[PDB]
């Protein structure tokens with residue numbers, strides 16, 4: 777692809793993080809902690825899942841960023857509306873204000889309702905995410921496989937400002953402790 781010139785510097789917003797998460801000092805990495813991280817509760821925090829938002833809000837233009845997923849067994853990535861539900865159980869779908877892909881149990885899927893099987897021959901170690909606000913597009917790229925297309929959501933109805941969205945996943949297996957990292961430009 778040729779989206780690299782729309783690169784944006786994303787940072788994580790601590791205040792939105794599930795209380796288990798550890799965000800690095802530079803706000804560019806996040807991982808699962810092995811306990812509650814000794815923060816107060818607030819209405820922004822995702823309660824049920826190991827999720828966090830980027831600080832940046834987008835309401836126009838073209839935006840691109842990359843995320844390192846090396847050695848993780850489970851994660852979700854994409855964008856979401858600023859006003860998505862934070863508390864309780866919910867599915868990742870455009871109806872609920874999410875445009876995401878995930879890895880779970882050795883398969884990759886797009887967060888449509890119902891979910892869509894992805895066809896990835898080279899397991900990615902870094903994912904590129906492109907948003908075209910005006911066009912209503914969110915696309916995902918396999919940086920490990922020379923930028924090949926993973927998935928395009930088109931005819932998106934964003935219906936609000938967008939935020940970068942992250943889920944580091946659960947670590948029930950002991951094999952999913954590795955962080956999500958925002959890769960340098």
Ligand SMILES: CS(=O)(=O)Cc1nc2ccccc2[nH]1
Pocket residue numbers: 794796808823824825826945946947948
């Ligand atoms: C099973 S676990 O992944 O190793 C620890 C954990 N349990 C959680 C419950 C809710 C949100 C995040 C959570 N992290």
